[PDB]
Each structure stands twice: as C-alpha cells, then as structure tokens.
Design a protein around this ligand. Sequence first.
Ligand SMILES: NC(=O)C1=CN([C@@H]2O[C@H](COP(=O)(O)OP(=O)(O)OC[C@H]3O[C@@H](n4cnc5c(N)ncnc54)[C@H](O)[C@@H]3O)[C@@H](O)[C@H]2O)C=CC1
Ligand SMILES: NC(=O)C1=CN([C@@H]2O[C@H](COP(=O)(O)OP(=O)(O)OC[C@H]3O[C@@H](n4cnc5c(N)ncnc54)[C@H](O)[C@@H]3O)[C@@H](O)[C@H]2O)C=CC1
Ligand SMILES: NC(=O)C1=CN([C@@H]2O[C@H](COP(=O)(O)OP(=O)(O)OC[C@H]3O[C@@H](n4cnc5c(N)ncnc54)[C@H](O)[C@@H]3O)[C@@H](O)[C@H]2O)C=CC1
Ligand SMILES: NC(=O)C1=CN([C@@H]2O[C@H](COP(=O)(O)OP(=O)(O)OC[C@H]3O[C@@H](n4cnc5c(N)ncnc54)[C@H](O)[C@@H]3O)[C@@H](O)[C@H]2O)C=CC1
Ligand SMILES: OC[C@H]1O[C@@H](O)[C@H](O)[C@@H](O)[C@@H]1O
Ligand SMILES: OC[C@H]1O[C@@H](O)[C@H](O)[C@@H](O)[C@@H]1O
Ligand SMILES: OC[C@H]1O[C@@H](O)[C@H](O)[C@@H](O)[C@@H]1O
Ligand SMILES: OC[C@H]1O[C@@H](O)[C@H](O)[C@@H](O)[C@@H]1O
Ligand SMILES: [Cl-]
Ligand SMILES: [Cl-]
Lengths: 262, 267, 263, 267
Amino acid sequence: HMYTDLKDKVVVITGGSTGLGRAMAVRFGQEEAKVVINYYNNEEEALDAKKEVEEAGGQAIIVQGDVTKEEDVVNLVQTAIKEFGTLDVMINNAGVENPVPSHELSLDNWNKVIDTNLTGAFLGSREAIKYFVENDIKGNVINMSSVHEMIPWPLFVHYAASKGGMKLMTETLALEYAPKGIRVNNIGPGAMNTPINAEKFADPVQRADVESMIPMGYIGKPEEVAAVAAFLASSQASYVTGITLFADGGMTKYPSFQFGRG
Amino acid sequence: HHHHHHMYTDLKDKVVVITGGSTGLGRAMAVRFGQEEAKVVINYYNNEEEALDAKKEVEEAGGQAIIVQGDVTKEEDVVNLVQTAIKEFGTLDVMINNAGVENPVPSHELSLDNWNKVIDTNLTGAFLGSREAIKYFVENDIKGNVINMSSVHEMIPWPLFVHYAASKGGMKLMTETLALEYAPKGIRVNNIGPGAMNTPINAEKFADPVQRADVESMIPMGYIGKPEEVAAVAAFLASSQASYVTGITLFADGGMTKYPSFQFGRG
Amino acid sequence: HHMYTDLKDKVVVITGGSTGLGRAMAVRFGQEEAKVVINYYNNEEEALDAKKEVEEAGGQAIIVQGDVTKEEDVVNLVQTAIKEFGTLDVMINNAGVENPVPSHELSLDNWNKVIDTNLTGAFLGSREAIKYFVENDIKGNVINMSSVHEMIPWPLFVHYAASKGGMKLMTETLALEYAPKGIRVNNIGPGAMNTPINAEKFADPVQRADVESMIPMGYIGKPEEVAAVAAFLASSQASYVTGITLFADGGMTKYPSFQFGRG
Amino acid sequence: HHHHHHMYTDLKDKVVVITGGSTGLGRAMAVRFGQEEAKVVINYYNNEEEALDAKKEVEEAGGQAIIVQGDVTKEEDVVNLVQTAIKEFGTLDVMINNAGVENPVPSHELSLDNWNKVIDTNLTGAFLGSREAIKYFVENDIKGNVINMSSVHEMIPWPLFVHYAASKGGMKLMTETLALEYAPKGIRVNNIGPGAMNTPINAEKFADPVQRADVESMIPMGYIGKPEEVAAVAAFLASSQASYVTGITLFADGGMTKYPSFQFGRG
Ligand SMILES: NC(=O)C1=CN([C@@H]2O[C@H](COP(=O)(O)OP(=O)(O)OC[C@H]3O[C@@H](n4cnc5c(N)ncnc54)[C@H](O)[C@@H]3O)[C@@H](O)[C@H]2O)C=CC1
Ligand SMILES: NC(=O)C1=CN([C@@H]2O[C@H](COP(=O)(O)OP(=O)(O)OC[C@H]3O[C@@H](n4cnc5c(N)ncnc54)[C@H](O)[C@@H]3O)[C@@H](O)[C@H]2O)C=CC1
Ligand SMILES: NC(=O)C1=CN([C@@H]2O[C@H](COP(=O)(O)OP(=O)(O)OC[C@H]3O[C@@H](n4cnc5c(N)ncnc54)[C@H](O)[C@@H]3O)[C@@H](O)[C@H]2O)C=CC1
Ligand SMILES: NC(=O)C1=CN([C@@H]2O[C@H](COP(=O)(O)OP(=O)(O)OC[C@H]3O[C@@H](n4cnc5c(N)ncnc54)[C@H](O)[C@@H]3O)[C@@H](O)[C@H]2O)C=CC1
Ligand SMILES: OC[C@H]1O[C@@H](O)[C@H](O)[C@@H](O)[C@@H]1O
Ligand SMILES: OC[C@H]1O[C@@H](O)[C@H](O)[C@@H](O)[C@@H]1O
Ligand SMILES: OC[C@H]1O[C@@H](O)[C@H](O)[C@@H](O)[C@@H]1O
Ligand SMILES: OC[C@H]1O[C@@H](O)[C@H](O)[C@@H](O)[C@@H]1O
Ligand SMILES: [Cl-]
Ligand SMILES: [Cl-]
C-alpha cells in the first residue's frame, strides 16, 4: 500500500458508514489503519462499512454517536483509545444540509445544521487535541468542509455558515497547536456522488445542471476525496497545516466565467 | 433644527436598528446615524441608564432614538426588536447586527457552554437579526440594508479565541450568502471587519501598558482605532453611495489583515 | 458645498482620467472641489472634454499626456502635478487594457502589453507618489483600480487576471510597508461597468444580457458608483482603512451560478 | 529494474520538466520524481556542473534525467525546453515552473529594471512554461498537469519585496485562470505555496543566526522546511491521487499564512 506510515494508525471518522466517510474508512483500511467508524443510527450499514475496511486490509470497530451530544463525542474518542490503545487521526466528517429560503429558515433548522456541522467538528477536534496534548502525540485532525466555506450558497445559509465557521475553527486550532506538531486541516469537496446528493442526482436535468457547474465536467467519485484525506493524514503532508485543500474539479474558480464570459 | 450640512443626505429619516447599540462600536454607530438625522433604535442587554445616555447623544447629534431591551440569543427578543422599530417609526431601513462577546480559553479546555454562548451571541444572533429584517424587506418590496459587525477574525485566526474566530468566519459566509440570495431584490448585505478598537471589549487589556503596547505593535498604522472610524464605514455602507456594494467585508483595521509580522521584509 | 469637505483642494492624479471610470472619478473629485490631474494616452480632445466637466462640476483640472508603460511619462506626470498644483494628495492608478485570447495562443507581446500597462503602470505610479509622500512627510493616499478579476479567474483574459492578481499583492504590500507613515494604499474591484472597455461587448444585445445575468444585483454598474467608492477611500472617512480591496460589483465575487440553491 | 517500492505507481515513466531543477526546491522535486521512476528534464540557468550532479542524483534514486540550459525570461529558450523534453522522451506529462528570484529593496526606491527582472522571471517565465505545455497537451489530447511554484507571498504581503509579492499574486490568478480554462480537457493546473524553506534562495539570510531564528519565530511549526517536504506535495499534485484537484494553491508553510503574530491569544 501507498502510505506506509499510516499502517497501524488509529483513525476516527464521524459519519464513517456512508458516502465520503465510508470511502475514507475504506481507504484508511487499504493503508492498514485501525478505523473507528462512528454512525448515527444505521448499525447494519455501519457493519457493512466495518466489513469493507477489514476486507481492504485494515481493522475496524463501530461506535454509535450523535455528534451534537458532547457525551457521545467524548465516548467516541475514549472508545478509540481503549479499543486500539491510542489515537492518531481524527476525522470530523458528519454533516447535514437542506434547502430553505433564508428569510423562511427556522431557528431549529439553523441550529441543527450549525450543531452537526460546526459544533460537532469543534467537539471532535477538542477531544482529539486534548488527547494529543496530554500525551505528546504529534496527532492529526481533518475536518470535512466544503467549497461552501468559500462559495456562498443561497437557500443553504445554515450550511454555508457552518463551513465558514469550520474554516476559521480549523485555521485557529492549526495555529494554536502547530508548535506541538499537531496538524489541523480542512478538505473542501465539490459536488460528490454520495447519499447527500442522491435525490438531486436522480433527476437527469438537475444532475446535468450540477455537472455544468463543474469545470472538470464530472461529479466527483468519493475515493478522490479519500485520496486527499490519506495524503493529509500522512507524513507526506508533514509541513502542511491550517489549509483547506479543495477537491472540486474547479468549482471554486467561478464556473460562470468560463470561456471569457462576464 | 438643520443648522449643519450632513454627509449622507439619503440617510435622513432612515430607520436604523443597532444591537449592542449602547456601548463601544454600537454607540459610535448610533451617534453617527443620528448625525445624519436617522431614526436610531438602540438595542441593549442590561445597563438601561447607559442606553439612555446613548439615546441622549443620538438626539443631541440630531437624530431620533428609542431604547429597546433584548438578548440577541433569545429569538423572541430579536423578533420584538424588529417589531418595535416598525411599530414606533413606521418602517425599517437598515439592520445592524453588532452585539458580540469574547473571552480567552485554550481551545483544548474550552467548554461547550462557553463555545455555545459565543456562537449563539456572535453568529446566531446576527442570523436572527438578519432574517427578521430581510423578512420585512421582502414582504414590503423595500430595498433594505443589512450590516453585520464581523472582525479581522473572519480572516485572522485567533488562538485562545477559537469560538469567536469560528463565529466571525460563519458570519462571512452567512452575509455573503444573504447578499447573493437577495441581491436581485436590491437588498444589500455587508460585513465590517474592525481591527483593535478603543471600546469596552478591550478595556481590561488596554489598562495594562505593556499589553496596550503589544496590541499597537500589531497594528501597522500604529494606533488603536477610534470607534467613529468604524461608524464612518457603516454610514458609507448603509448609504446609497455604496449602491453597487454587496456581499463584501470592509476591513477597517489599520492594516491588521496584511500580516503585521512581515513588515520590514522579515520572513 | 459637498460630501467630503476634506477633499477640497486636494491634488488628485488619475491615469486613464479621460474616459470610463477614470473620467467618472475625475468629475466626482471635481464635485468635491479637488484639483484633478487628468492623465491621458492620446485622445487630447476627449481629455479636454473631461477637463471641462471637472471645472463645471466645481474643481480645477489640468491634462497631462503620458503612456504609463513609460517610466519617464509616469515620473513627468507626478512632477507636473506637483509643479502645477503645488503638491500631491491622491494617486489614482486607473489606466488598464484587455482583449480575449485563448491562453495557449496568447503572444508574449500581448501578455506584456497588458502586464506593463495594468500592473507595472500602477507600480510606477504608486512608487512615484509614495516617494513624494515619504520625502515630504505627507500622509498621502493611493488608489489602484483593480477588478473582481483579482479574485475571479478569467479564461481568455489570463494576462488581465494575472495583472490584477499582481496588483492585489502590490497594493497590500505597499499598504503594509507604508502604513507606519500614515500613507494609505487601497484597491477598488469593480464588476461589469458601463465604459468603453465594454462598448463593443455591450453593443451586442446577447452578450449584454449574458453579462447582466452574471450580476446578482441585475444591472451593469454606472461609473459614478465606482467614483463614489474612490471618493470614500480618498477621504478621511476611511482614515483606518488601508490595504483593502473594496469590491463594487453588484455581487459578482459571490459566485453568480450558485443562486437559487443550484450546485 | 523495479527492485524497490515507490509511493505513486502512476508517475512511472511520466515526463516531468522542472525549471530551476538543479538547486533548492527544483532539485528536491527532480529527485523525488526520480524516486517515482519518472523521466526528469532538469532545466538550469548557468551552472552546468551542478545540473549534472542533480542529473546523477535523479538516476541514482531510480529515474531518468537530461539537462537543458535555458533562461525562463527568453521565449525561444522556454519553447526549446518543451521541444527538447518532447524530442528526448517522446512526450510531456508534467510541467513544473519553479525558477524564481528575489532581492530586498524599499519599494519607493525600487527600479523599473529590478521590478521587471523579478516579474519577468517569476510570473512571465511561469506563463511561457504553462503556455507551451498546455499548447502541446491540447494539440495531442493529453490530460497533462501543470505545477507552478508560488509562495506564501501570493497571500502574505511582503514589504521590501513588492515585486516578488506581485509576481506571486499574479501567478495565483494565472494558475487559477488556466485551471478554469483547461479543466474541461482534463488538464490540471495548481500552485504550491511554500513557506520558509532551506534552499540557496535563503542561504545568506540563514547563515546569519539572528535572521535564522527570527524567521523560525515566524513559523508556527517551529522549523525551516526541508525541501523534500515541498517535493512530497509536488509528487501528490502530479499524481492521479489528485485527480479532482485543480486551480488550488496548496500551502506547505508550517502555518505561516495563519498569521504568526496572533499566536498565544495576542492582539
Ligand atoms: N457529497 C458532497 O457533494 C459534499 C459533501 N461534503 C461534506 O461531506 C460530509 C459527508 O457527507 P456525504 O458523505 O456527502 O453524505 P452523507 O449524508 O452520506 O454523510 C453524512 C453522514 O453524517 C452522519 N450524521 C448526520 N448527523 C449526525 C449526527 N448528529 N451524529 C453523527 N453522525 C451524523 C450521517 O448519518 C451520514 O453518515 C458532510 O459533512 C458534507 O457537508 C462537502 C462537500 C461536498
Ligand atoms: N472593538 C474591537 O476591538 C472589535 C470588536 N468588534 C466587534 O464589534 C462588536 C461590538 O463590540 P465592542 O463595541 O467593541 O465592545 P462592547 O463589548 O462594548 O460591545 C458589545 C455589545 O454587545 C452587547 N451584548 C453582549 N451580549 C449580548 C446579547 N446576548 N444580546 C444583546 N446584546 C449583547 C453588550 O451589552 C455590548 O453593548 C462585537 O460584535 C465585536 O465582535 C470586532 C472587531 C474588533
Ligand atoms: N469597466 C469595467 O467593467 C471594469 C474595468 N476596471 C478597470 O477600470 C480601468 C479603466 O477602464 P475603463 O474606464 O473601464 O475603460 P476605458 O478603456 O475607458 O479606460 C482605460 C483607460 O486607460 C487608458 N490607457 C490605456 N493604456 C494606457 C497607457 N499605456 N498609458 C496611459 N493610459 C492608458 C485608456 O486610454 C483609457 O483612458 C482599467 O484599469 C480596468 O482594468 C476593472 C474592473 C471593471
Ligand atoms: N525557498 C523558499 O523559502 C521559497 C521559495 N519558493 C519558490 O521556489 C522557487 C525555487 O527557489 P529555491 O529553490 O527556494 O531557491 P533557488 O534560488 O535555489 O532556486 C531558484 C532556481 O531558479 C533558477 N533561475 C533563476 N533565474 C532563472 C532564469 N532567468 N532562467 C532559468 N532559471 C532561473 C536558478 O538557477 C535556481 O536554480 C522560486 O520560484 C521561489 O520563489 C517560494 C516559497 C518559499
Ligand atoms: O455545491 C457543491 C456541493 O457542496 C456540498 O458541500 C454539498 O454537500 C453538496 O450537496 C453540493 O453538491
Ligand atoms: O485582534 C484585534 C481585535 O479583534 C477583535 O475582533 C476583538 O474583539 C478585539 O478584542 C481584538 O483586539
Ligand atoms: O517568507 C517566507 C519565504 O517566502 C518565499 O517565497 C521566499 O522565497 C523566501 O525567501 C521566504 O523565506
Ligand atoms: O467581468 C467583469 C468585468 O471585469 C473587468 O475587470 C473587465 O474590465 C470587464 O470587461 C468585465 O466586464
Ligand atoms: Cl502576522
Ligand atoms: Cl460562478
């Protein structure tokens, strides 16, 4: 396998049983990592993910957790440390979204997205970093952001806001913990073939519409993001902290200005 | 009396709501919109005689003003603020979401309670404020204006203040999104990003002459900002002089976002 | 009487000052009763028309010929402003050019023309003004005319994009370097504006509507809306504002294709 | 022979052109691509012996190398480089524009000649290289790759180095434009943004122990980067591991762009 330094590393992944979280889990499995798959409620799906990691050449457990509950996130990290003996890479990937005209957006609906996407990642990051600090481990944190930490997103102001906050949260943590060798980075995916986009990509007109907004011309395969994660988690990225590495087929470069329009 | 010319004639009689409007930057803004003959609604949290002191100044500067108690983390208080303004003055023209808090905690030691108070105040309160105003603007075909009080820390990361940094980074994307969502209605939404300003949020810090000097050493222009320098920016952004300006963050920071340590060709 | 009382009798130099945004700024500074030095490349009568507009608006004005790609022309321009009006207060580097070319087919000469005018021109202007400000303890002001394309990449206009991207870091550097002296240096980033740079494009009704479809606010900007930004930046109202790019773009930098929850 | 493992199998036999390939970051990239069993075209300015040494290192690490003299400010020399890569190896896969120069001058003192040398070398040179590679890629339907060596100074302003900073900010928008322009053909274009690195560009500066420590104090990770740390990013960006990655600047800077002065909760 590609990243030899990733062998036997303990990697926790929130939302690790579907879409991007699962591609990441599998890829860390391919690197002979020990993967801790957090899941919200679909245990049968998490078990399939667990199997895939093992099949790929890694070790895997599954831990139920709601990233909006502090006790759950504390449990999630404690379990990784107890079961595998340490923690090396923390991946806050869990996130949700839904379209609502902004002036019509309820506080409850706003809160759900902030709590899940932003505060969820803070809690994970804090628990991981607490462990690295207490134990002198030059650990790693990867937060799953989006092109929407840069690209504003009407009807998804809660989402955009959550990712914007994630950006400064990551950059702050990276700066604060850099002198201890703790690296903190975001990945910013573009439009990806995952369950979050399942209904949208079912409609051939909407799918064609999303594609027209991707300069590279195709919706991303989840393994393309998993590749980014493996790089960032690895010692290949030893001098890289505080960044957002966009994997977006050109989305953040303003797709409407193609061909010299404007 | 109209015994002096004012800079932005289009601001005269405009209804301007300002959260945290009784102190620091909020008060400086309140006073400035008064100077332009605006109808200022000063929101405050607890100190009523402070709020009344500010209402006095808005009037003495040439504006109209009411004070309204409200906690921006409380949804009904935000709805009430916007409702009070429309009831008392007949409309709403400019929403200024300025209330905010901060405190230093090593991030690995930051409690959810503490994180949440900062996120709820700084970011969520600004969303609520913005939502209420834009709701009103939309239902009445008013080309209204929102100003959110961000910081240099929507760009500058801030160790020991990870919650504050996150709240301001969220406000950026919130503001930018609203700006884009509502641009076709001519509703403009913008951030201001102050650097170190001489206000109560910094009073403890600035009382210590070594820290005061340290903060100044991080300001390329070499002095801590006067609150009226920020209000000058809000007055501009709120006015029709900024008609083509939406979705921006206007930093008023004496050069802080330009990386103070790289002066003199260091690095 | 006018908006920014502190702009009265300030000496303001404007490259490309005879057309488009340049002319709109010249007239606006005239309304603020400033002394405007209109630099122009080679249309003397248009520059004379612009001078007449400044004066009527309530300012003073001179016209000075100069090619911003020539160091001696830029030196002469600043020197002329000082000799004629006595000093220099605001340097506006606004001259710029563009043309579409597939990047893999773009000639070096063409690359160079756009780079030298748009970026190196603004450097020369900025350097000359700052040199004067520094030698004479003046708290002067520099405004460089950038574009949304210091942030929005622009296929077929790679030379232009590169020029504005460079101008961004140039301005930010100078602002940092000279802030301790009270010299403010800022960019303006306009979106699509109604000027001669876009005349041929906007005479074509399909292209015109296509550009308008990329402006969230729904209209091509009027030059006066950019001049309003310049007046604000030059004035003491912006006393604490340096090193920024103030986009005036009707929302263009916000990604127009992401409206309506697309993506 | 393939007697040892390497990380990126898809880089095997890829043709990789590196300007300034004989020293510093260029040399580390040349070698790393050699470790990946690539075919490396080492462009060099005037020190032939040093280039031949670099050639030897690449071969010893497991690659093929040739050396091509060329001044990146000369159109014909850049054209020659690409044509020589294509003639000698049969194709071109990865174009790396890495040559760059700098020198400290107070900005109001900086000569046109000195400004032009830096702009022509750093920005224009990178344009010509990117143009020639992309021309070839387009004519032959190759899904090629361009890596331009930028700097933290495409984001961090740099007094005394205004020419260098402009050149890198210009590179940012050039790279992002090209990436947008040629993404539909599957040609990927990216920048690397290194922080302070241990190379000949910083040699005089780092031999001064007080400047050395001063620079270190501005790097949050606490150390001057090793050149192979940038090489690692280049290997990544060039591989199909980065298949969905284009138009980006990947900063490898030990945290420099995160504003080193705001550590410890200062400001
Ligand atoms: N797929 C895309 O196009 C893009 C999505 N990404 C981000 O990637 C992340 C993963 O989403 P995808 O794999 O795309 O779709 P997904 O919907 O399959 O993944 C989201 C995962 O988070 C979990 N989750 C939701 N709430 C939770 C909670 N309270 N506690 C614990 N887990 C919870 C879900 O059960 C699910 O496993 C999200 O953060 C999303 O914002 C961002 C950029 C592009
Ligand atoms: N002064 C500075 O150096 C900078 C401050 N600004 C921002 O400007 C804003 C105002 O702060 P300053 O005037 O500087 O200091 P300040 O502390 O005097 O102002 C904050 C105001 O918000 C109010 N507030 C706090 N919690 C509230 C709540 N839950 N509901 C309603 N109001 C509440 C306070 O009563 C106070 O009036 C803040 O958003 C801060 O983030 C940001 C950049 C720099
Ligand atoms: N109109 C638009 O949509 C936008 C244009 N702006 C910028 O505005 C600036 C002015 O252009 P516009 O007024 O829009 O169109 P314009 O073409 O009327 O203005 C360009 C001016 O620069 C002058 N100029 C060109 N080469 C020169 C040289 N070598 N020496 C001296 N002067 C020279 C031209 O004669 C002309 O007066 C340019 O820098 C352009 O990049 C940028 C953003 C938006
Ligand atoms: N070392 C550092 O701290 C950083 C440097 N990088 C960039 O990395 C690149 C390489 O520099 P380093 O390896 O660090 O130092 P270096 O000085 O060893 O490398 C520069 C190379 O460019 C070549 N070169 C200069 N002018 C040339 C010309 N006209 N034609 C052809 N080749 C020419 C030199 O011969 C030399 O091989 C530069 O573009 C630099 O701006 C940027 C960020 C950090
Ligand atoms: O806009 C591109 C993508 O942004 C992501 O953050 C969202 O999760 C996707 O639903 C969307 O397709
Ligand atoms: O860092 C500069 C300033 O940033 C602001 O956002 C904070 O409110 C101040 O406490 C601080 O002095
Ligand atoms: O400031 C960080 C580094 O920036 C690079 O672009 C320069 O080439 C180096 O000389 C400098 O040390
Ligand atoms: O794309 C918006 C505008 O950007 C400006 O920099 C160009 O000069 C215009 O021709 C263009 O319409
Ligand atoms: Cl800094
Ligand atoms: Cl777009």
